[PDB]
Structures are given as C-alpha cells and as structure tokens.
Amino acid sequence: DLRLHLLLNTSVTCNDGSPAGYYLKESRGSRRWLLFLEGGWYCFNRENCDSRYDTMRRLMSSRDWPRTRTGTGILSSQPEENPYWWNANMVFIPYCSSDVWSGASSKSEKNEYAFMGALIIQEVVRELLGRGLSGAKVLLLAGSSAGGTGVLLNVDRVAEQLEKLGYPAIQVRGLADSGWLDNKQYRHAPTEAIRRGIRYWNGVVPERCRRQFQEGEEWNCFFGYKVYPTLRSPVFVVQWLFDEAQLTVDNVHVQEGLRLYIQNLGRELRHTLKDVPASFAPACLSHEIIIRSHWTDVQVKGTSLPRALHCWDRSLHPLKGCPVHLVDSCPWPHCNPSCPT
Ligand SMILES: NNC(=O)c1ccccc1OCc1ccccc1
Ligand SMILES: *[C@@H]1O[C@H](CO)[C@@H](O)[C@H](O)[C@H]1NC(C)=O
C-alpha cells in the first residue's frame, strides 16, 4: 500500500479546485525513486469537461480519493511481481487535470476549471525532496497512456528543476508506456481536439520542441515521434504496435482494405522506433502494461520487459545477451505468441 498525501501548497489543484496529491511508499534502503503518472484521456472544452465531471469525477477532483492504493506491476514491492525495481521508493501521482499533464492555468472568474498538470508534477517533486528524494541517485519518471505522453512532455523540465534547485547528482530518466501517430483514419479530426485543448489549458510543451514548430503549432509536440528527438534525458519507450487507443481513434473495430490498413499501421509505428535505442514494441493488440500485475509475461525475441529495463539500467552505467532495443518485425496482431489474452 502507498499512502495519500495532499499537496501542502493548496494553490496547486485538480480541475475543480480541490488539492492535488500523490501516494507514497518509502524504501529507506534505496536511493531509487519511481514517480508514475496515471492516464485517462482528457477534455478540451467546457461542455466536454462538464460531461467528464459527472461520470469520471475522480479524474477531476481529490474529494473522493481513498487514503491508500495497492502498488502493482512496476509499483509492486514483491520481487516475484517486480523483478526490475522491487526495492525502490514508489510514487503514484493521480491524473486529475484532464490536460495530458501539460496545463498551467488556475481556476479564476474566467476559468470554470483549473488545468495544472505540468505544475502538479513540479510541486510533487518539490515536496518529495523533504521526504528523502534529496538523497536519490536516479529519478525515473514513468507513466501510462496520457501519462506516457506526459513523461515525454515533462521529463526534461523535471531535470531542469532539480538542476536549478541545486541537485546535480540526481539522474532523471523517463519511461513512456502506451503514449506514442497522427495518421489517416480508416473511416471518417482527432488532432483538432489537441490543438483546441492546448489553448483551453494554457498547455506547455518542451522548449526545444516549441522552438522547432513555433506559435500555433505546439500540438505537434504531443506526438512521440516528433517530440522525442528534442529530448536530452534518457527515455525508454514501450508501445504496442497495434495499440487499442490508436485503433479506436482511427475508427477500427477482415477484408483486404482493412488488412492493408492494419499492416501499414504496424509498419509505420515500427519505422518511427528505428532510431530509438531503448524501446520495447510487441506485435499485440492491447493498451498499457507497466502497472499490470502480469507485465512480466510478455517477451520480444525472448526478452521480457522487466529484463529490458534492467539492461537499460546497465547501459547507463552493446551488452552481451542483455538487449535494450526490442521491436517485433512480424506484421499482424498476436504474431508474437506471448501477447496478452
Ligand atoms: N488516450 N490518448 C491520449 O491521451 C493522447 C495523448 C497524446 C496525443 C493524443 C492522444 O489521444 C488523442 C489522439 C490519439 C491518436 C491520434 C490522434 C489523437
Ligand atoms: C504554490 O504554488 C503556486 C502555483 O505554482 C506558486 O505560485 C507558489 O509559489 C507556490 N507557493 C509556495 C509557497 O511555494
């Protein structure tokens, strides 16, 4: 169990103005810290956010949060469930800002909701330095789905924040799960929601990416294959080749037209990962993995995800029999026998 702490700075809030927070389980014999960003889509105007507040309120408010959560997958403290970092300090940061962790706007007389995702991450980091983070050797910022995209948008800002606060020894790294294409749909734009959303959230993107695409075009930096090349921090990318959220937005739910569509989608995703040295991309139809309890089951070319992350740690001290770049080449969902059921 990880125990809830509401932010001491009550001006950093969820959508409805309630305090944001984090769940923490300390491991005093470890100098490794895992900060995990939750996912869960987003909302991009008043009417769409009002609907989310009726039936997804825990993703917009802390008023009903439980005092504990069970750590699972990479957040589990059992060696059998988590071969990678079972002894780390564990942090789960709930997603209550509906802004893909990009926002920096407070509730006010002209804003019905606050969108503070980028500031929530910084304040969590700030308050953890008083509870042990000051002695860390590695800070791994991880996340799934919208939280995976949030890793890509925030990992270099966390690095910069610790540098400016006087902590040069903490190595900041990223792990982005299921947050990696602005492709043509199979049937008939989803990118327009992101464009409109950034403007609604006062959303912020990494500076080098901002400078490449310039004003009005920051939505491009929400797409992994465009923002990843601008990042300095080491980032490991986990992405199913046939991601279910990607297929949903593409309006896919088999004859030749769809067969070619699906095969091209896998081809394109594999192409964008060619020059990503730390990555894990199985040929499966699925979504998310790193906090699922059976995340140890899937393998690419005989290597599990916990093993690949361990090999990544070793590389940041090619390695013999301990690979870090693992991308399926077979071209159809579940041609990898270890895919989830
Ligand atoms: N669940 N998905 C997210 O959170 C997300 C995060 C970053 C960028 C877009 C996202 O979805 C919208 C979308 C997905 C695929 C193609 C176009 C648009
Ligand atoms: C509280 O957070 C707000 C919003 O980020 C910031 O303006 C302010 O400096 C913070 N207060 C303190 C005491 O750090």
From Swiss-Prot:
GO biological process, one term: negative regulation of Wnt signaling pathway
GO cellular component: endoplasmic reticulum lumen; extracellular region
EC primary class: hydrolase
Active-site residues, Swiss-Prot/TrEMBL: S145 (charge relay system), D243 (charge relay system), H287 (charge relay system)
SS bond partners: none
Carbohydrate attachment residues: N9
Tissues expressing this chain: Rarely expressed in adult normal tissues.
Inducers of expression: Up-regulated in hepatocellular carcinoma (HCC) with high intracellular beta-catenin.
MF term (GO), any: palmitoleyl hydrolase activity
EC number: 3.1.1.98
Location(s), subcellular: Secreted
Catalytic activity: [Wnt protein]-O-(9Z)-hexadecenoyl-L-serine + H2O = [Wnt protein]-L-serine + (9Z)-hexadecenoate + H(+)
Keyword line: Glycoprotein, Hydrolase, Phosphoprotein, Secreted, Serine esterase, Signal, Wnt signaling pathway
Family: Belongs to the pectinacetylesterase family. Notum subfamily.
Biological role stated in the UniProt entry: Carboxylesterase that acts as a key negative regulator of the Wnt signaling pathway by specifically mediating depalmitoleoylation of WNT proteins. Serine palmitoleoylation of WNT proteins is required for efficient binding to frizzled receptors.
Record's protein name: Palmitoleoyl-protein carboxylesterase NOTUM
Organism: Homo sapiens
Gene name linked to the record: NOTUM
Full protein: residues contained: 88 to 451 of 496
